[model samples]
Target: GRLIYTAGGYFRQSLSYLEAYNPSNGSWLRLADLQVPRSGLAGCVVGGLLYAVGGRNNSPDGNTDSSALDCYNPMTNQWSPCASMSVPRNRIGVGVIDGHIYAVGGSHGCIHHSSVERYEPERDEWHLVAPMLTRRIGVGVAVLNRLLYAVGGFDGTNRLNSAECYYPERNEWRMITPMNTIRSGAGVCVLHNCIYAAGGYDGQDQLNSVERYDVETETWTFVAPMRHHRSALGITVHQGKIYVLGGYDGHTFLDSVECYDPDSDTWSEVTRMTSGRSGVGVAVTMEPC
Candidate 1:
């Protein structure tokens, strides 16, 4: 399988997926353009449906926000419109459990967000879920064993290190072990019974540190650091490895792609992204069967 990515544009606004195939020996292809042109968007895949969440358009003079929800079916290689979120939020964290997708906190202009919304493809409707313990932007969200977890992010004024998990059945949120370091704009996903949080900003500085949360013990542990400090980078798990894609590192944007092998707790540089971007989305999705 190949790793697909969207580029950073419009300051934080851009569109298009960079399809990188490792099995094919470093082959690259520019895939179809997005239906909408924007950045700071989030994505997740469920049952072959790839959903792109809210984002903002970097208009130079002003910010244009999007409440747009777009779904892609790789089988047809096309995107279709889905029901929008209740509130438009850019740089939001997206997660899925059961048959529903949960879009967690995010913002571009505002500093506060405690809202969590769920999307149902069968009904094409949205349902508000339990709010997070904290309201922050650029959160890292993941689900393991039916519980949804939201990790490190900025709380309007400072970077956060605390993590929380939501019990959907009880409709309650509880604190878990905090991250080793406080960071925002990090990438998170579940692999091997643990949730990996990697590459984000620590308020004043960009970081390359990587850590993992054990669902069983509800604690945090360190892994390998990334090759570069990248906040707002795109991370996706394909085959058996986690791929880190384009992101910004305060001073400049990046195109380097890195992979983390959990077993060895190591990182290696892989193929580079064709387009340089800061805010991007990465996910593993397929067209419907």
Candidate 2:
């Protein structure tokens, strides 16, 4: 039951740190920080709340794109501020099916966007979905059985192996099977029903290549490959394993942490982040009982 990482930085260090990882005692907890600084965000966990979307604010010079919506409540660690987002994104692509909260594609600074939004926390409001046929910037959203996949990215000029899925009761967005190579900030999740695309940026390097998507035979296999070559990493899964965090490997900016074990598909290396992130924002929250 250990997992919870948020906030991120790199490229002028726009950070507001917060950490958590206690896989029953592998230990790490440095909570409550982000209230401002951010970096290419996109985090999830509905119902048990811990959402943080849209990012880039804290200009180290020419950096400002935030439709900020933060909300954490680790059973009372508190930190709220929701309802924001009309368009002002950054590396977006978040997910949460039934309880709503979907913010796809990203980038409003160098353009690149295929807008898609939805967030209705009992009417805190934010609507407008079904708008991603392509037009990305580090996209990676997941939600198995209930549909809502959308991987690979960087469409401001190539760096995408295309992939899509989203059918919230037929709002439609289908178009899948693509991802053998091309990527951009990849790091998706979904355990049993399959869909894992970690480590990114293949426009000519910065990738440790890892792919696996088999939502009942749509096929896209090739696993085990991450000793470090990340792009904008921050993957999540927990228990069944698959946690790759902090990124950017075109040279420096990585808190180096890894885990992947599809029952032995292998990829080991953990505990190594205290700072040195690269536009990160990870999540796996659900601890309120």
Candidate 3:
């Protein structure tokens, strides 16, 4: 699968461009640009197309939220607009299961939301789904064994240590065991049947702590911490390895990247990005075998 990074925060300027990485050559390639400029958006790949979901499209003063949904076709190298969400959101959680893209809890501008929605490419429509119990923003979401796991995030007031899972068949979300450390703006990825939640803010400080959720046991355990304290970063699994890319620490924006090996329970530095960024979105699309 190919890893792609969509728009994100770049100091005074926001990004609408997309860049992809090639593990074989250890290089980055620029791809087609998004139709609209946005930051804090959630992106997912379904049916071989990359979909960019709701976020803010701040160009001048920079406090606007948008409901724009843009789909990119890698084969054609083009972008198209799909049906927009009923509610405008940013800093949301997104996951793909059974051909549907689930957009979970996020804030509408400065207001946190609990509403959830699903987009079906076949129908080109957005449908309301069961909402999350807690209103959250900057949540970490990932799919594991057909269930979507919504991890720690900001709930408008405080950082959350709680976690939850959603079942599409039952159309309900149920709470799971909370994390040991409260966090928001963390990165989450599913690797080797375990959901790994990485660095983020812990209310008081930027965290380098990492935790893993065992699906069968439904418990959280500490793993090796990353070299950097990353918040608003992008995480994705590639060839059985978990890759965490660009984000901001408490000090400055980071272009540094690292990988976690589940088998060995270790973290290793990888190739750095060309520029520093945060709030970027990463998705994996497999090449032809």
Q: Can you give the TM-score per candidate against the true fold?
A: 0.93, 0.31, 0.95
Ranking 1 against 3 by TM-score, winner:
3
Task: Point out the higher-scoring one by lDDT: 1 or 2.
Answer: 2
- lDDT winner, 2 or 3: 3
Candidate 2 whole-model C-alpha lDDT, 0 to 1? 0.82
Best by lDDT: 3
Q: Give the TM-score of candidate 2.
A: 0.31
Ranking by lDDT, best first? 3, 2, 1
Reference-based lDDT, each prediction = 0.79, 0.82, 0.84
Worst 10 residues of 2 by lDDT: 2-11
Please give the TM-score that candidate 1 achieves against the real structure: 0.93
Global local distance difference test of model 3: 0.84
Candidate 3 to truth, TM: 0.95
Model 3 residue 221 CA deviation in Å: 0.6
Candidate 1 residue pairs in clash (backbone atoms < 3 Å) = 9-13, 9-14, 10-13
Estimate, for each residue in 177-276, the C-alpha lDDT of model 2 and write its tens digit: 8988888888888899898898788888888878888988998898879999888888888888888887889778887888988988999887788777
Residue-by-residue lDDT tens digits, candidate 3, 124-239: 99999998988888999999889988899999899999999998899999999998889898998898778889998888888888999998898899999999998888888888
